[PDB]
Ligand SMILES: OC[C@H]1NC[C@H](O)[C@@H](O)[C@@H]1O[C@H]1O[C@H](CO)[C@@H](O)[C@H](O)[C@@H]1O
């Protein structure tokens with residue numbers, strides 16, 4: 001029965017550490033984490049905000065608040081998943097917690113605005129640095145990749161005690177906005193609202209130069225980005241690019257989609273190679289986060305996935321390519337939407353979160369990866385938990401041994417007083433029991449080996465062999481066999 005146990009983590013509040021980099025929630029979190037422990041929770045997840053830690057200047061890392069937070073977590077006896085959060089928290093009208101990337105990095109942007117992902121109207125998105133500057137030494141002598149590597153190295157050195165004590169068990173490497181490996185193709189601040197197709201965010205001068213060179217390398221120097229793609233809030237059929245039998249299918253469209261999605265893959269590969277080197281020999285898993293772009297999954301162009309950078313079509317597996325890139329690093333996939341049913345979604349959005357989840361989990365498992373999941377949106381109801389349970393053990397319980405497939409972990413978004421009071425807590429606690437296959441909490445489950453060095457670098461052509469033939473997912477049971485109620 002023990003092979004069925006799925007670990008449950010809970011995300012901490014976005015302001016677990018204050019926006020001024022002070023630890024202020026000692027008493028509150030102590031009581032809240034005690035409730036989590038009483039409920040059987042294996043660990044917590046937390047954003048380690050770049051804007052807080054390296055906020056005062058290059059290499060001025062102030063870890064003092066995170067250390068206090070981490071001691072609290074260790075004192076509670078909980079495991080810890082640390083997100084290298086190289087992205088802005090909040091920043092939209094109405095957001096409660098607002099933590100931009102370091103001011104001194106934004107200061108570079110006042111002179112070189114092309115450090116930011118840029119749309120076709122020229123709007124600069126300040127939430128994250130363009131993958132176009134990964135290897136450009138623009139930041140007081142450092143490249144973006146060097147800044148990420150140096151931050152992770154400082155983290156390791158300063159948190160060594162927590163790593164050695166087995167408190168920190170997972171490093172989630174932020175690779176884009178919201179920590180997700182994607183482009184910022186659906187920004188509320190630029191006027192997007194659900195379920196707009198989004199936009200291609202490749203207009204910064206660095207990416208423009210990259211495209212031109214890539215185009216010349218295949219004999220077509222003349223080529224430009226597609227200009228029949230509409231705008232953020234369009235539907236696919238309103239554009240010549242994304243409509244059925246549209247220009248996304250052309251030789252030109254295919255080249256562009258490949259270039260855009262490949263650049264995201266290369267960004268992840270090169271940052272994971274550095275992260276692996278940093279954490280070599282520590283008993284931790286490295287993970288990336290893939291965003292759950294479920295809208296337009298039911299139309300041929302998969303338009304919102306394409307603009308996010310996931311080149312996914314009925315005959316092209318745009319997630320298995322990503323999974324193949326992760327293999328050499330022994331990195332895990334952290335996906336979302338684990339809580340969603342298709343019946344809960346708007347019809348006109350053409351949304352299929354269940355099939356998308358099935359596609360991403362199946363891709364990870366076919367590449368031999370650990371796969372974990374999060375809920376996309378806040379949920380406290382038994383139906384949500386039953387959906388997560390279904391995704392956690394897609395073929396149900398194996399009474400003989402471990403199941404054919406299971407999630408390596410699930411991380412719940414997110415801790416607050418609401419979760420640990422009233423009927424919410426009862427529902428949550430029962431969820432954790434079921435995730436644990438009704439066994440008691442086992443802190444020693446899923447032990448990590450010392451992280452080995454990433455295997456040999458493989459080319460983009462090698463990675464892309466995973467795109468086709470596109471396979472049906474593994475069959476998933478309609479309903480969990482171990483529901484909450
Ligand atoms: O965890 C990543 C995102 N998954 C999909 C959710 O809808 C979204 O809200 C999540 O992003 C938030 O939480 C992250 C972890 O706390 C944080 O890094 C990110 O900035 C968002 O606040």
Ligand SMILES: [Cl-]
Nearest residue numbers: 366468469471
């Ligand atoms: Cl295969």
